Amino acid sequence: MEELEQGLLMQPWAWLQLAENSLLAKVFITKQGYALLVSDLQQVWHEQVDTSVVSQRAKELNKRLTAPPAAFLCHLDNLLRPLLKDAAHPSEATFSCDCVADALILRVRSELSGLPFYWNFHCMLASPSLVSQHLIRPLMGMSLALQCQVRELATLLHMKDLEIQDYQESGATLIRDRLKTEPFEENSFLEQFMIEKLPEACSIGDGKPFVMNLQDLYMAVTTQHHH
Amino acid sequence: MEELEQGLLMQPWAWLQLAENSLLAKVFITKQGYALLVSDLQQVWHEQVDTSVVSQRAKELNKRLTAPPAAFLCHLDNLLRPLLKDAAHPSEATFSCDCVADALILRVRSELSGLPFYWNFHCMLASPSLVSQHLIRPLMGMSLALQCQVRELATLLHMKDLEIQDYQESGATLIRDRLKTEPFEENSFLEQFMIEKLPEACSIGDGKPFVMNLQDLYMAVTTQHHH
Amino acid sequence: MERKISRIHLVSEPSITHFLQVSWEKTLESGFVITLTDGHSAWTGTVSESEISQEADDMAMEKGKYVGELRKALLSGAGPADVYTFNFSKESCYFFFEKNLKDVSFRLGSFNLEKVENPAEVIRELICYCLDTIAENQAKNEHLQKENERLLRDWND
Amino acid sequence: MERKISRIHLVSEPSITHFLQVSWEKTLESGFVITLTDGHSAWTGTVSESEISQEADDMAMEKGKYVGELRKALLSGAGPADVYTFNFSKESCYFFFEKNLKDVSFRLGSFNLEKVENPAEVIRELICYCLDTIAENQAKNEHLQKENERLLRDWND
């Protein structure tokens, strides 16, 4: 049963559009069941299901269900992989959200082979241990790694100034005088960045930017953290 | 009472060394009481206290306490600001940690003006709302903003290459030929970074690097997020 | 007042061919009569407009969308991608059919049929209808065949 | 290999309608198979080329002229002026028909039919044939309908 949780840690975050709200979600489906993690950037919800739960719930939701749990799970996997990987891909699904106190019920309304399909995700508040493993620790790791990049680019910029100063030191004149770069000084670059650029650049919004520019680094950090 | 929580959100994370473990902690103390938040990078603990609680607990801890809560709170603030702001500053305090199921008890053993002093922080698991406001959201904002820096530095690097090429295009010769930089290509810069540097760069460890290289960005993101 | 007679195969008798006759009045939606026969016995059932709409709810399908599925399954206007299965128990007279997808199938409908007292009468009426249909079609095919000949000539000269 | 299915009324059962199915191979003259059904039981018989020629002699008719009478009587291609009567005895399985003139009628033909062991199989095959015929006709009616539309246009422009 631990396999589902293991595969979940490696999954990136996808972006989903719901009734009025958008959610961030990662999911891992096998023949054994599934593990799902959802967040609205205020709270985090979790659900892990096995084959017994699948059969019971599918029978109750789709009254004329004559299918093994494995096939139902495979249909959910096939329905959700295109829809998540690109939030603009037209998968035959429609989502609704119900918040019952601390629980989140994610409802799916779809059509497979001209037949309607129903599934409800029963999510409880994610344990703090998973919030740490899936968000905090990786997010903190990403920030440290990005800060090393900034540092390596700044050294690279200082190296190019030593090169430009070698041209200025010698008998080297610029032709197009609109090309002159101001020598790079990190302290002033940060100061202008923090006043001029930070306001929009740190806006998390609906999590779309996070899913669009960082999932590659997210997957690299999680794999690193897990050896 | 809300003022304490509000001031807590603006506080940066400090590094603390305990019995066997190290903790991350932020605190906001006034004459009204305090708000504290602690994390071991696995769980997050919180406590908010008022003047009534201070008096009762101080009397029970320091059997010869003849002080208003205000003064006791000011001593805690004056004892902990130097010790936190620089984890190498010698403040007369010593810490111990006891974990009772879901709760954390942070014990302080200090000496003020040659007189011993005792205080225990009684922390319950932090609500998910605080974990989001104090960790997740700001950490996510930092990663986005750092990713903008990288992008702005790469454009700066490509701008310096157009300048060096303008020298090579014209009657310009290098004097010290050991100064020539390789033209900057972001794709190869990332590929070498992800294989060669990421493994150590994203090592969260005991949270010390986070408190040492990122708190400035943390405070700037939190202030931004809160308008 | 329309009708369709289709040839079907039951799961409990893949050997023998059965016939399904469905009749209605200006949409299946308003209700229909279904008859099953093996050329010896006959089983009939009625489906009211109310039952149809009810079935469309129990299945969680839009009423019109549901009637569309019935047309493909019962009036043998099923696509190659639409595979239908039919089951019947001569002991219970219960008739039900399912739609077959990739290794999974779903109950599409069910009827409690009643064994007819006068099968011969029913079979005779069905055959009568077929012959009239064959007749009407042949006549039209002839009228169109001559019009085709007239136009062929009129075009030439 | 052709066939015609006609509806007929027997004198001994003017109430019920019966069906006559005649099948042959490239002329009635070379012999044919006749089947009678009431939708429950079925009776079959064969008529050889020799029997036909013999019957034409016993009646004092030219063979081809006789076969013409059979076509009108058995393949329901009878004129308004041609009135035919059919008789059948379930007890003897004897089948015979006459042509009716002004208050006088004359034996046109007679067959000793045999009660079929598997009526359902026979009835099912007959209905199957009817449905295939309805199908072939519809296809042709459509093909001719389009060819009619093409010629209508080709004539105009």
Name chain A contacts of C103, Cβ cutoff 8 Å. Answer: 67, 71
Last residue in a domain, options A142, A175, A196: A142
Q: HEC states along C13-31?
A: EEEEEEEEEEEECCCHHHE
Min distance C57 CA to chain D CA atoms (Å): 34
Same domain? For A104 and A134 the reply is yes
Mutation target among A59, A76, A115 for the C interface, most CBs of C within 10 A: A115
Closest residue in chain C to residue A115, using alpha carbons only: C61
Residue A186's alpha-carbon distances to A62, A151, A191, A197, in angstroms, are 61, 9, 9, 15
Closest residue in chain B to residue A169, using alpha carbons only: B175
Crossing angle (nearest 10°) for helices B137-169 and A137-169: 20
Min distance C77 CA to chain D CA atoms (Å): 13
The residues, ordered by sequence, that sit 6+ positions from B51 with a Cβ below 8 Å of its Cβ are: B31, B32, B33, B69, B70
Asked if the C-beta of B226 comes within 8 angstroms of chain A's C-beta atoms, the answer is no
Name chain A contacts of C69, Cβ cutoff 8 Å. Answer: 114
Same domain? For B216 and B160 the reply is yes
Give CA–CA dist C142/C131, Å, rounded.
Answer: 17
Instruction: Please provide the distance, in angstroms rounded to a whole number, between the alpha carbons at the two ends of chain C.
Output: 44
Last residue in a domain, options B142, B172, B193: B142
Q: CB of D4 within 8 A of CB of D75? A: yes
Element housing A128 (H / E): helix A128-131
Give CA–CA dist B144/A142, Å, rounded.
Answer: 10
Give CA–CA dist D80/D62, Å, rounded.
Answer: 23
* CATH number for B170: 1.10.287.450
Number of other residues whose CB lies within 10 A of the CB of residue D106: 9
Chain breaks in chain B (C to N over 2.5 A) after: none
Asked if the C-beta of C118 comes within 8 angstroms of chain D's C-beta atoms, the answer is no
Mutation target among C102, C105, C107 for the A interface, most CBs of A within 10 A: C102
Name chain A contacts of C106, Cβ cutoff 8 Å. Answer: 62, 64-67, 115
Number of other residues whose CB lies within 10 A of the CB of residue C28: 22
Mutation target among A46, A123, A143, A186 for the B interface, most CBs of B within 10 A: A143
> For the residues of B10-30, what is the DSSP string, one character each?
TSPPEEEE-SS-EEEEEEEE-
Which segments of C61-105 does DSSP mark as H helices, in order?
Answer: 63-74
Among B129, B135, B197, select the one facing A136 at the smallest CB separation: B135
Distance of CA A185 to the CA centre of its chain: 34
Min distance C75 CA to chain A CA atoms (Å): 18
How many inter-chain contacts (C to D, CB under 8 Å) are there?
89
Instruction: Please provide the distance, in angstroms rounded to a whole number, between the alpha carbons at the two ends of chain B.
Output: 21
Residue type, B21: N
| B120 closest CA partner among B56, B68, B66, B64 | B56
Number of other residues whose CB lies within 10 A of the CB of residue B123: 22
> For the residues of D91-155, what is the DSSP string, one character each?
TT-EEEEEEE-SS-EEEEEEEE-EE-S-HHHHHHHHHHHHHHHHHHHHHHHHHHHHHHHHHHHHH
Q: Do B and A make contact, counting contact as 3+ CB pairs within 8 angstroms?
A: yes
Same domain? For A130 and A167 the reply is no
Look up the domain containing B201 and give its range: 143-227
Number of other residues whose CB lies within 10 A of the CB of residue B137: 19
Same domain? For A134 and A151 the reply is no
Give CA–CA dist B11/B213, Å, rounded.
Answer: 16
Same domain? For B16 and B123 the reply is yes
How many independent structural domains does chain A possess?
2
Q: Map residue A186 onto helix, strand or coil.
A: helix
Number of other residues whose CB lies within 10 A of the CB of residue B106: 21
Same domain? For B5 and B116 the reply is yes
Which residue in the block uniquely carries the two structure tokens 């990403």? A142
Same domain? For A135 and A161 the reply is no
Name chain D contacts of C122, Cβ cutoff 8 Å. Answer: 39
Element housing A77 (H / E): helix A69-85
Most distant CA atoms of chain B, gap in Å: 85
Among A161, A201, A221, select the one facing B148 at the smallest CB separation: A201
Two tokens at B178? 């050991």
Last residue in a domain, options A142, A163, A198: A142
Two tokens at A51? 């084959």
The answer to whether the CB atoms of B204 and A224 lie below 8 A apart is no
Min distance A63 CA to chain C CA atoms (Å): 7
CA dihedral A125, A127, A130, A131 (to 10 degrees): 60
Distance of CA A22 to the CA centre of its chain: 13
With 0-12 CB in 10 A as exposed, 13-18 as middle and 19+ as buried, what is C41? Answer: middle
Among A135, A153, A175, select the one facing B157 at the smallest CB separation: A153
Give CA–CA dist A75/B204, Å, rounded.
Answer: 38
Query: Is domain D2-117 classified as CATH 2.170.210.10?
Result: yes
Name chain B contacts of A142, Cβ cutoff 8 Å. Answer: 143, 202
Q: How many alpha carbons lie under 13 Å from residue A175 in its C-beta half-sphere?
A: 11
Asked if the C-beta of C135 comes within 8 angstroms of chain D's C-beta atoms, the answer is no
Q: CB of A199 within 8 A of CB of B218? A: no
Element housing A151 (H / E): helix A137-169
Contacts 24+ apart (CB under 8 A), A47-54: A47/A121, A47/A122, A47/A123, A47/A124, A48/A1, A48/A4, A48/A5, A50/A1
Min distance A77 CA to chain B CA atoms (Å): 28
The answer to whether the CB atoms of A114 and C60 lie below 8 A apart is no
Which residue in the block uniquely carries the two structure tokens 């590659």? A216
Which residue in the block uniquely carries the two structure tokens 């949780």? A5
List the C83-88 sheet strands across, edge first. C105-112, C94-100, C83-88, C2-10, C13-24, C31-37, C42-48, C114-115
Q: Map residue B2 onto helix, strand or coil.
A: helix
The CA-CA-CA angle for residues C51, C55, C56, to 5°, reads 120
| D143 closest CA partner among C78, C141, C135 | C141
Min distance A92 CA to chain C CA atoms (Å): 15
Among C17, C128, C154, select the one facing D17 at the smallest CB separation: C128
Closest residue in chain C to residue D37, using alpha carbons only: C124
Residue C115's alpha-carbon distances to A33, C24, C35, in angstroms, are 46, 20, 10
> For the residues of D15-67, what is the DSSP string, one character each?
EEEEEEEEEESS-GGGEEEEEEE-SS-EEEEEEEHHHHHHHHHHTT--HHHHH
The CA-CA-CA angle for residues B173, B178, B184, to 5°, reads 85
Give CA–CA dist A180/C151, Å, rounded.
Answer: 84
Residue A37's alpha-carbon distances to A5, A54, A144, A192, A219, in angstroms, are 10, 17, 24, 38, 16
The answer to whether the CB atoms of C120 and D38 lie below 8 A apart is yes
Crossing angle (nearest 10°) for helices A69-85 and A51-61: 80
Min distance C104 CA to chain D CA atoms (Å): 31
Domain boundaries, chain D: 2-117, 118-157
Give CA–CA dist B106/B99, Å, rounded.
Answer: 9
Same domain? For A137 and A147 the reply is no
Beta bridge partners of B112: B115
Resolution (A): 5.5
Min distance B16 CA to chain A CA atoms (Å): 18
Closest residue in chain C to residue D129, using alpha carbons only: C130
Name chain C contacts of A114, Cβ cutoff 8 Å. Answer: 69, 82
Give CA–CA dist D32/B143, Å, rounded.
Answer: 92
Instruction: Please provide the distance, in angstroms rounded to a whole number, between the alpha carbons at the two ends of chain D.
Output: 43
| A63 closest CA partner among C24, C98, B191, D147 | C98
| B26 closest CA partner among B133, B113, B98 | B133
Same domain? For A76 and A119 the reply is yes
Handedness of CA A126, A131, A133, A138 (dihedral sign): positive
Asked if the C-beta of A103 comes within 8 angstroms of chain B's C-beta atoms, the answer is no
Same domain? For A31 and A104 the reply is yes
Two tokens at B119? 């205080």
Q: CB of C47 within 8 A of CB of C57? A: no
The answer to whether the CB atoms of C123 and D39 lie below 8 A apart is yes
Which segments of B86-174 does DSSP mark as H helices, in order?
Answer: 128-131, 137-169
Number of other residues whose CB lies within 10 A of the CB of residue B109: 13
The answer to whether the CB atoms of D40 and C151 lie below 8 A apart is no
Which segments of chain C does DSSP mark as H helices, in order?
Answer: 49-58, 63-74, 119-156
Q: Are strands B22-29 and B33-39 parallel, antiparallel or unpaired?
A: antiparallel
The answer to whether the CB atoms of C106 and A66 lie below 8 A apart is yes
* CATH number for A40: 2.170.210.10
The answer to whether the CB atoms of B189 and A152 lie below 8 A apart is yes
With 0-12 CB in 10 A as exposed, 13-18 as middle and 19+ as buried, what is D104? Answer: exposed
Same domain? For A113 and A189 the reply is no
With 0-12 CB in 10 A as exposed, 13-18 as middle and 19+ as buried, what is D95? Answer: buried
The answer to whether the CB atoms of C134 and D138 lie below 8 A apart is no
Give CA–CA dist B92/B86, Å, rounded.
Answer: 14
Same domain? For A138 and A54 the reply is yes
